[PDB]
Paper text:
In order to understand the structural changes during evolution that shifted the enzymatic substrate specificity of the apicomplexan dehydrogenases, we determined the high-resolution crystal structures of three ancestral proteins bracketing the key duplication event: AncMDH2, AncLDH*, and AncMDH2-INS. Each protein was crystallized with multiple substrates or ligands (lactate, malate, and oxamate inhibitor) and with NADH (resolution ranging from 1.35 Å to 2.05 Å). Unfortunately, in all crystals with malate, the malate spontaneously converted to pyruvate and/or lactate via redox reactions and decarboxylation. The alternative AncMDH2 (AncMDH2*) differs from AncMDH2 by 27 residues; the alternative AncLDH (AncLDH*) differs from AncLDH by 19 residues. AncMDH2* is a strict MDH, and AncLDH* is a strict LDH. The ancestral AncLDH* and modern apicomplexan LDH structures are likewise highly similar (RMSD ∼0.8 Å for the loop-closed states), while sharing only 63–71% sequence identity. The first shell active site residues are identical in the AncLDH* and modern Toxoplasma LDHs, comprising the same residues as the apicomplexan MDH active site with the sole exception of position 102, which is replaced by Trp107f in the LDHs. In both the ancestral and modern LDH structures, Trp107f and Arg109 are the only residues from the specificity loop that interact with the substrate. As in the modern LDH structures, ancestral Lys102 does not interact with the substrate but points away from the active site into solution. In contrast, Trp107f is buried within the active site, with the edge of the indole ring interacting with the pyruvate C3 methyl, which is the very chemical moiety that distinguishes pyruvate from oxaloacetate.
Residue numbers in the entry:
A (entry chain D), B (entry chain A), C (entry chain B), D (entry chain C): 5 to 328
């Protein structure tokens, strides 16, 4: 009587397929790979189905161009949209140039979620992340706690990796957060970086790392997306983005109460409301179950507010289109 | 001081990166992504490094364009090559058309394995699989038991998947083997298909599956690679090929004594010698530890011989190109 | 909101605690450890809770002496009862001697399952297995397909282990089944043993194993439980029994459609009905979804019938106790 | 040529067996279960071998009464000892009471490690922990960095569990350390407790947890071992101790560079030397690679010094017994 969890991946591109692969490997549930491109998602679904046999896991992987197949989905993860705006080089790529392109897609997707799986937990990945999640939320009519954006987990995992590498410790034992908008005004929280709860400052004071190296890592974290785009030559990152979204999905599916930075609907926290922005949150069976309001210093609070200001800017541009 | 296992991936494209992802997820050991394309492997290595942080695993992922970095690898997995021959068409995709382009790449890679990592266990993926592994082996100087080709695990995973699908059981509990050349004359062994050891014939007698349905599944298995190419539009399968090769690498790294079908150097088994072709084998810490010689019926033996003949015919082309 | 799966373990002894540990490690769901012994399950639940933190899993483990706490359990696994009959030596240890003691306990548990979690999938472990599961089913009023006994997965795992050990191959690649009653008259199906679908017979001919060795392995499988008892000195096996029951529980919870040998309610299969006996079955979200009827030879069929008669002998003793 | 890792467990009791189970589930390497009791480890090894087949893992489990079988071990984990001093009661259970019984055992074990596997990484569990590891180290001749005691990971996991429970978040996201002696004077470092790097102090201010609740948890953490002893009625904890020890073993075997609190040989850190005591350490392929010196406050430093003093006093008892 109790069926497997159902996870619909709206967008079967690099990140879409990669998330499906994680689902197959982890046996998270049945997977629906949706895309507007004909044949391709069916192709990937076949490949993934074969991969599940190798993994000795029990997972149906379905490729589709029909929104009807997302019916009854427990989780929906959205990557539909463009990665690199047309006519832009590698060394000038920006998430903000995509807004006119991707906003209309979020409406169509939101509308379809509304009628096929209105009780799904929905994770948005499409850029510009923080406004795309807002557009999705509006047109889907979903509860504020059942929709969020993936960015913070990815930005934070990068911050963690860079710190872990410099200190030569397991990234499991580094805690680091990046809050705010997903972009150049993201706010890596150096003051909150710990090694198993030990303040990063203790490693400074002990000369395991210098403040200047920390400053460089902060900058590298902010630019990490572009760094990868430049090195690859084609497209952008997808391994860590896929893993990031699936960590959020697992938190929901198994009611884990993970503390993860996600793009969450604010209802007054940090003195802001009516937008999604990167904040630490408790993720569980009820979606975004809690937004944690950090005791930011005035300096930190100003960086966050400037970050939120960027989102506000894009939001008007969205308003000057016609997507409620 | 016992270091982590070191796995070098020669070729950092679709399958290479995907394999590196599994290594990160599974914490198999440190990964070197080698490619001739500048910067791209470094870019992917960054993305994969970030994903390892998310996975809470402890894995070093290095992107490189220098064969020196493969020194002392425990396992080397080779994907270097073209996926589709230049100037060809989708429905006309053939593994054989890659022979003249990929043959010389196998010579180059072999020469470099010879000098930098002669003690590695080497898994070849590059198509056309069975002759590519021969070129690699010949030019690398490695022992016969330390080189093999990934094909049988993938072909068998497909055969298993389709059987499991039709019978509606877990693929874990379906045993199916495909032997011979990795191409149109591969031999799906219907007589050897079992469900937890229960012969497929019992399911036929009990009317759970028909001979006609089995026949369709046999042909579908043969055409699976091309089916995916036609659907994907760009490139060929990579999720299952990646998983297959890593299953083989795991068998070596942890001396598992897995029974896997791989392209192995024959020394009289099945009445054939001095070529690589798909056969059931025991894989462990000594590489291809044992080729299993199945009690084939005359009909099966003839199918196998015709399969081997295709490898011999491809070999004539290798010889005529002057690639040994 | 969707809650985590809930698994109630009725009996918190060795097997009970061990299953709880697997649950914590695998994050299968929240665990309730029930026992009539005061304080002990609370103590184990604390210990296990700490182990879940170490494992980075998200699992509540609750020890209890009250049946109310099994409310809403998705799976119930029952180990309540004695392991050894009082006034019996190890060399005379017999599962049959546990009957009058454990029969009455199965009645109580079934009554409590009826009122507290009538929709659970129930796995009985308590000996004498095949008749204990019938008692439990009778007094629980549960559907025939939602109750079964763990025995065949354990007996088969032993058969597999001993075969794999002799052939020196991965137990993953050995398929072996033991059907019939869980006792001296269990039936290890030598004819159905395969190595990745390859009949064991081929390895006899190829000289990797002899019929004499196989015969001795059959005997060792039958005696495996008593062999461990004699070696241990106190109680009986628990690591493999726990793992066997959890494998069954996982098949249900994730609707895997695994082919596992379990003690299942027969309704005409093999020419028998209205008793539980070990047979191959497909386990999924609807419990015992299908009982597979093997094409046993007359000789095999006679061994199985003899096995079934042993269950009937025990059953008649149950009738004596005046418990319907 | 490259063999599986080899892990020897000196002591095949509750914790020994449980650790072997984890090795089997995780496929960490082959396992030797050593004990002075005849037949018992052989019995457990069989049970565990069967469970490996169920897990589809590839692990040899060997029971023995001969030290010769621990030769070539990569890791050795020692649980040889009594759990409760004879003549004593549960409520008055004290690890210190075990000293005169287990000290001579550590000498015996140490002597045998000296001659059979001097190159192993050795983890001691036997109580009283901090002085038992010292006796073992003294009589084994091993390097200072290749020997340590399991305590801090367990104490910390308990601290973590209790904090995570109260705040209703995943224990993955709670960082908490307990340093010092493994006993009543252990030091749960409240100041260093974080939720993904967020200081616990913020949660106090935001009214998510009270100082009173924290004080209770600190006491509960100190008393946790005795709490379980009282509840179980027999023996002491084993699920979490086994897991803690395996976490340490994994960190070594795969060179993970984990930050874990372990009883480590001090050489001037914190102002102390030549004793083992619980401190944060980096564990990797070189064993105890680094002892981290925390910037303790003067109050915290006093607690730690008082904790170290307890070890010194236990050490006085060792010398008085005639065990150096
Ligand atoms: N069953 C099987 O055996 C399968 C085989 N394949 C084969 O695997 C190969 C790779 O497939 P994908 O990873 O999808 O292709 P891909 O095109 O994504 O990656 C191939 C990579 O090899 C690199 N390369 C080219 N020359 C090289 C050299 N001399 N040394 C090192 N690297 C070099 C390229 O720069 C490219 O990044 C193809 O030959 C394909 O036919 C693919 C799927 C299944
Ligand atoms: N946090 C910690 O450090 C913890 C420490 N412990 C300690 O771990 C030790 C073992 O606990 P359990 O496994 O539960 O006890 P157990 O009584 O179940 O097993 C102890 C085993 O050691 C064996 N043994 C005795 N003398 C020996 C010798 N000379 N050589 C080899 N083996 C010998 C016994 O035969 C017995 O099987 C105890 O000393 C206990 O106090 C237990 C829990 C947590
Ligand atoms: N931190 C982050 O949030 C993060 C990280 C990486 C990428 N991204 C973003 O995620 C998105 C996906 O990236 P990718 O690498 O998978 O790109 P991709 O080009 O590989 O995938 C996009 C897919 O969406 C499909 N698509 C386009 N319009 C659609 C519609 N109306 N309905 C359904 N599908 C449609 C395309 O056919 C394509 O397959 C991009 O917008 C990218 O900017 C975000
Ligand atoms: N193949 C198999 O099916 C298989 C394998 C191993 C053991 N077993 C059987 O499984 C059972 C459990 O074995 P074990 O090693 O866990 O024994 P154990 O003695 O360690 O555990 C039995 C537990 O059941 C409890 N109990 C007794 N009456 C109860 C009641 N009315 N309600 C709740 N709990 C009650 C006891 O207090 C004890 O904690 C035994 O009957 C044994 O014969 C079966």
């Amino acid at each position: 009587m109790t069926k497997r969890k159902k996870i619909s991946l709206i967008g079967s591109g690099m990140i879409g397929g990669t998330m499906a692969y994680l689902c197959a490997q982890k046996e998270l549930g049945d997977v629906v790979l949706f895309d507007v491109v004909k044949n391709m998602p069916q192709g990937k679904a076949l490949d993934l189905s074969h991969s599940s046999s190798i993994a000795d896991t029990n997972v149906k992987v379905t490729g589709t161009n029909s929104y009807e197949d997302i019916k009854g989905s427990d989780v929906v993860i959205i990557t539909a949209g463009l990665t690199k705006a047309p006519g832009k080089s590698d060394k000038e790529w920006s998430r903000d140039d995509l807004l006119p392109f991707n906003a209309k897609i979020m409406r169509e997707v939101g509308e379809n979620i509304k009628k096929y799986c209105p009780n799904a937990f929905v994770i948005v990945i499409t850029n510009p992340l923080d406004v795309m999640v807002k557009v999705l939320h509006e047109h889907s009519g979903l509860p504020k706690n059942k929709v969020c954006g993936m960015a913070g987990v990815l930005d934070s995992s990068r911050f963690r990796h860079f710190i872990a590498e410099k200190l030569n410790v397991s990234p499991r034992d580094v805690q680091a957060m990046v809050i705010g908008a997903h972009g150049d005004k993201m706010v890596p929280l150096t003051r909150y970086v710990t090694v198993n709860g030990i303040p990063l400052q203790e490693f400074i004071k002990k000369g395991r790392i210098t403040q200047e190296e920390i400053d460089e890592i902060v900058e590298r974290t902010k630019n990490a997306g572009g760094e990868i785009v430049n090195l690859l030559g084609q497209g952008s990152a997808y391994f860590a983005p896929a893993a990031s979204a699936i960590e959020m999905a697992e938190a929901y599916l198994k009611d884990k109460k993970r503390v993860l930075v996600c793009s969450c609907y604010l209802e007054g926290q940090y003195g802001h409301k009516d937008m999604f922005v990167g904040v630490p949150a408790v993720i569980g069976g009820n979606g975004v179950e809690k937004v944690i309001e950090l005791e930011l210093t005035p300096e930190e609070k100003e960086l966050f507010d400037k970050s939120v200001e960027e989102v506000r800017k894009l939001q008007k541009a969205i308003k000057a289109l016609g997507l409620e």
